[PDB]
Short mmCIF file of C-alpha atoms in Angstrom, two decimals:
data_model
loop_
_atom_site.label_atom_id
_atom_site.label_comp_id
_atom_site.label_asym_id
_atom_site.label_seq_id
_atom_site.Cartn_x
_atom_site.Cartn_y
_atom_site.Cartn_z
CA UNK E 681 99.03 102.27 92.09
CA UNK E 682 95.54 101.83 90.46
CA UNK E 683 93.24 99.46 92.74
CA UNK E 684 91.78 98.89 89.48
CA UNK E 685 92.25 95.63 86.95
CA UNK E 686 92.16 97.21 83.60
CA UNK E 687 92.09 95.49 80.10
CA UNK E 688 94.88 96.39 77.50
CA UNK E 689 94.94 95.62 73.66
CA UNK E 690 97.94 95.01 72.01
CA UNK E 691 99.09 94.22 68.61
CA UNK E 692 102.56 93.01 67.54
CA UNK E 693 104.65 94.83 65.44
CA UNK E 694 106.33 94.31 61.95
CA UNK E 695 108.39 91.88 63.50
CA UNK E 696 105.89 89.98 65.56
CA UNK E 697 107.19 91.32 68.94
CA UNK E 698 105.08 93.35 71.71
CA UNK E 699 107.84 93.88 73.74
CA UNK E 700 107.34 91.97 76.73
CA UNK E 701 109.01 89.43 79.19
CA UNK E 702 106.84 87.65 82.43
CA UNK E 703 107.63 85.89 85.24
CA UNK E 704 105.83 83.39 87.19
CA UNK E 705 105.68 84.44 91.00
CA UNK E 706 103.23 83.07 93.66
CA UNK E 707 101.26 81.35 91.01
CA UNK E 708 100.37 84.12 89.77
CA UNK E 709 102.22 86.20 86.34
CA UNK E 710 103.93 89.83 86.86
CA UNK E 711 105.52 91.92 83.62
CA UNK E 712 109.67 91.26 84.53
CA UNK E 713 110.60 93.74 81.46
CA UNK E 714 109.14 96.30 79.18
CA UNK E 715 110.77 97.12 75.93
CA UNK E 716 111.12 100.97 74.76
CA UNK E 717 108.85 101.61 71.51
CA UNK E 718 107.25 98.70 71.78
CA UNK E 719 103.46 97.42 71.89
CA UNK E 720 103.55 97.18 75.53
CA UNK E 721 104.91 100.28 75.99
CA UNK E 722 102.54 102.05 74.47
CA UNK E 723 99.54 100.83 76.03
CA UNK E 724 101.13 101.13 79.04
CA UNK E 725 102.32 98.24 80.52
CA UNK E 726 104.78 98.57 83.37
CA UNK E 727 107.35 96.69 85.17
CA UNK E 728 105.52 94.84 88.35
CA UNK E 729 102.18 94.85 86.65
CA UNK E 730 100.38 91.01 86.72
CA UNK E 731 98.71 89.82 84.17
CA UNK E 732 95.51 88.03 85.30
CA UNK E 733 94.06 87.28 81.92
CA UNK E 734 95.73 86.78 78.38
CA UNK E 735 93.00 86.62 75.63
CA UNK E 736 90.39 85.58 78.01
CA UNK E 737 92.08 82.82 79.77
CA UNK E 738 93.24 82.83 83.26
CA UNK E 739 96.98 82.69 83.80
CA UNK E 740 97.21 81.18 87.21
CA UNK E 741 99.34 78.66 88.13
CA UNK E 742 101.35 79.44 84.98
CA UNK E 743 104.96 79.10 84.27
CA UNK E 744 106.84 81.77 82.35
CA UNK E 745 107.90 79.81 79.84
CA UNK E 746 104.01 78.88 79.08
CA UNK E 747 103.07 82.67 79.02
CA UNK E 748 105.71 83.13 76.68
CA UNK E 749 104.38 80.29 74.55
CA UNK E 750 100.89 81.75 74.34
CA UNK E 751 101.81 85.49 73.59
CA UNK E 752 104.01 83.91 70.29
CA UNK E 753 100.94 81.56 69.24
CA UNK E 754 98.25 84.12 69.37
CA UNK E 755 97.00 86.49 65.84
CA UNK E 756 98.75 89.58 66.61
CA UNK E 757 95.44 91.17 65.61
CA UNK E 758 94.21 91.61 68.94
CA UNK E 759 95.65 90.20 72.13
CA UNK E 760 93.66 91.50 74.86
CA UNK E 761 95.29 91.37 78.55
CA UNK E 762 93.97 91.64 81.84
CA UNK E 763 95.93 93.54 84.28
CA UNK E 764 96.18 93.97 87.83
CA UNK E 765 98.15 97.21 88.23
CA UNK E 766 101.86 96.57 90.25
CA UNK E 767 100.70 94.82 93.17
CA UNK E 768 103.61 94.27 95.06
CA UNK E 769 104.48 98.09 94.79
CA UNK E 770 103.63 101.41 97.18
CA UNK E 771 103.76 105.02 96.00
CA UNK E 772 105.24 107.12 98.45
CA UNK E 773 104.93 111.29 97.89
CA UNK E 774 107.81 113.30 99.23
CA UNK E 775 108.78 116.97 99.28
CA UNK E 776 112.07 118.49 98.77
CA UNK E 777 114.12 120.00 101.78
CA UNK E 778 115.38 123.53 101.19
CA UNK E 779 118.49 122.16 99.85
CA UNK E 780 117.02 119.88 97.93
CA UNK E 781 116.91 116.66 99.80
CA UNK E 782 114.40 113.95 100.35
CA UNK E 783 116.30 112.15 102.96
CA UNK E 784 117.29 109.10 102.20
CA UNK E 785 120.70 106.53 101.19
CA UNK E 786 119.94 104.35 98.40
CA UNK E 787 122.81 102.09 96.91
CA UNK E 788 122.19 99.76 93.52
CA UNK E 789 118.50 101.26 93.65
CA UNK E 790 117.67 99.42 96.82
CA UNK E 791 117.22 102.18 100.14
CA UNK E 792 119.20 101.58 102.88
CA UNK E 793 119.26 104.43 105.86
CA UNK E 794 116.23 107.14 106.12
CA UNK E 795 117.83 110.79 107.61
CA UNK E 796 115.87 111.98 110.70
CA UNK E 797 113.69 114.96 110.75
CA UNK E 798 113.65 114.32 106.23
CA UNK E 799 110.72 114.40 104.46
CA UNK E 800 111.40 110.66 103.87
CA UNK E 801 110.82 109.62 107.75
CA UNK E 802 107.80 111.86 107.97
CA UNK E 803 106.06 109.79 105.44
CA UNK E 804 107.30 106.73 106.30
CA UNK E 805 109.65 105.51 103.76
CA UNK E 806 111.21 102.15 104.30
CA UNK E 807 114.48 100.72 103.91
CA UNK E 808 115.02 96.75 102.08
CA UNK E 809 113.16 98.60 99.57
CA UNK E 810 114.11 98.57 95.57
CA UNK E 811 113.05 101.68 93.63
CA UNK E 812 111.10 100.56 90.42
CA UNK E 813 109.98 104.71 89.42
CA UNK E 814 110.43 107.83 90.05
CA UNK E 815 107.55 110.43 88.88
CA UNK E 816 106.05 107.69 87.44
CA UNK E 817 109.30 107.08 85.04
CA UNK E 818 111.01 103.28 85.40
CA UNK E 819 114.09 104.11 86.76
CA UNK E 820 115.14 100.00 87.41
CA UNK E 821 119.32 99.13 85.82
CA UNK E 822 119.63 103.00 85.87
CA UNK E 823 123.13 104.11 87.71
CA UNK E 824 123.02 105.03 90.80
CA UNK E 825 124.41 108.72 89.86
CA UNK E 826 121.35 108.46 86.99
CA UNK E 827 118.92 108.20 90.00
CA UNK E 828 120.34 111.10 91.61
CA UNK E 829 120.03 113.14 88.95
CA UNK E 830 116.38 112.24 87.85
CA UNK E 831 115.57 113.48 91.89
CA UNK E 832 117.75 116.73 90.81
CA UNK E 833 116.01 117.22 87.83
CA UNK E 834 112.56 116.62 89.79
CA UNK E 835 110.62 119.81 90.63
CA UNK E 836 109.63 119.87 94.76
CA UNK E 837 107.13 117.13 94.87
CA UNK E 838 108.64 113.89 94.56
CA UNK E 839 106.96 110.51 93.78
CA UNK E 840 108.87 107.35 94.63
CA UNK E 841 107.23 103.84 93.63
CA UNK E 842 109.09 100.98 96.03
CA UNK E 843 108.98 97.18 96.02
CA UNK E 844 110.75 94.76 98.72
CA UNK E 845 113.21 94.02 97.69
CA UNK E 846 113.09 90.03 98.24
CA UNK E 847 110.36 90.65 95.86
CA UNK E 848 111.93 92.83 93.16
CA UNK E 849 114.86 90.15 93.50
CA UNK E 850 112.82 87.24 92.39
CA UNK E 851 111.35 88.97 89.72
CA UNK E 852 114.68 90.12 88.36
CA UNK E 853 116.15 86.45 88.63
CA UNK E 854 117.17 84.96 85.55
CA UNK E 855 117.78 88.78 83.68
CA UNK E 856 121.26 89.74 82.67
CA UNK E 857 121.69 93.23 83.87
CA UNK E 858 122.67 94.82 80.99
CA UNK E 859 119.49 94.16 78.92
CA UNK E 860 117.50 95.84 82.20
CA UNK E 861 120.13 98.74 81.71
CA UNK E 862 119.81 98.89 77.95
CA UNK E 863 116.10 97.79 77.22
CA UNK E 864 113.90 98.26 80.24
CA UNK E 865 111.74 101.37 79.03
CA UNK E 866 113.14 104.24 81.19
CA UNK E 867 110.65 107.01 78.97
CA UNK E 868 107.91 109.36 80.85
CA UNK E 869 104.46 108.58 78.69
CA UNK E 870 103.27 109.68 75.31
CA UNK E 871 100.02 111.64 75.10
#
């Protein structure tokens, strides 16, 4: 979680699509979905991220359906963006116990208990709390079982990016789960 705002420049695709979906949340407009192989995939937009700017002008006090109005209207050309990166999100690092355990119960994606003497309670990990990534991979409509197995799969060192949860809900509202399942980019970076 970069401290920074950054500037991104996308440019639709053949079909006149970057890939993106926002949601208007304390006045101010976060990224609700990311598409896979899309514009604002590959420039690196994530789930959680607010936009502050969209070509220049200032997106406060917008509604969603307005942002999605102005990223249609605008020359696919160049659509600059100005982005604060996910505020309403925490990394937490973690290492793996000798049997391979963080320490933690997590049920739909959202933590729920924190095992004593884990990893997890030594670094303070918090329960109410939605995973949104795991080694900086979007890990949001994936199975529980899914989950698991990306922390299998995951060498030692784990890296675990959290949201509350009565925030992650409200920015979810108003998203059939299957698209977040199906089209939610769940892909590590290209380089």
């Amino acid at each position: 979680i970069k401290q920074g705002i950054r500037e991104v420049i996308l440019c639709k695709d053949q079909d006149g699509k970057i890939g993106l979906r926002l949601k208007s949340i304390d006045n101010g407009i976060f990224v609700q979905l990311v598409q896979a192989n899309s514009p604002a995939s590959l420039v690196g937009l994530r789930f959680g991220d607010q936009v502050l700017q969209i070509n220049g002008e200032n997106c406060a006090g917008w509604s969603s359906d307005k942002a999605h109005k102005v990223l249609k209207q605008a020359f696919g050309e160049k659509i600059t963006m100005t982005i604060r990166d996910r505020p309403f999100e925490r990394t937490i690092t973690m290492h793996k116990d000798s049997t391979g355990h963080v320490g933690f119960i997590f049920k739909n994606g959202k933590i729920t208990s924190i095992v004593k003497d884990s990893s997890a309670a030594r670094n303070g990990l918090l329960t109410e709390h939605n995973i949104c990534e795991i080694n900086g991979q979007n890990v949001i409509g994936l199975k529980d079982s899914q989950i698991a197995d990306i922390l299998s799969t995951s060498g030692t060192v784990v890296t675990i990016t959290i949201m509350p949860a009565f925030i992650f809900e409200h920015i979810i509202k108003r998203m059939a789960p299957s698209i977040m399942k199906s089209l939610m980019d769940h892909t590590i970076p290209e380089v």
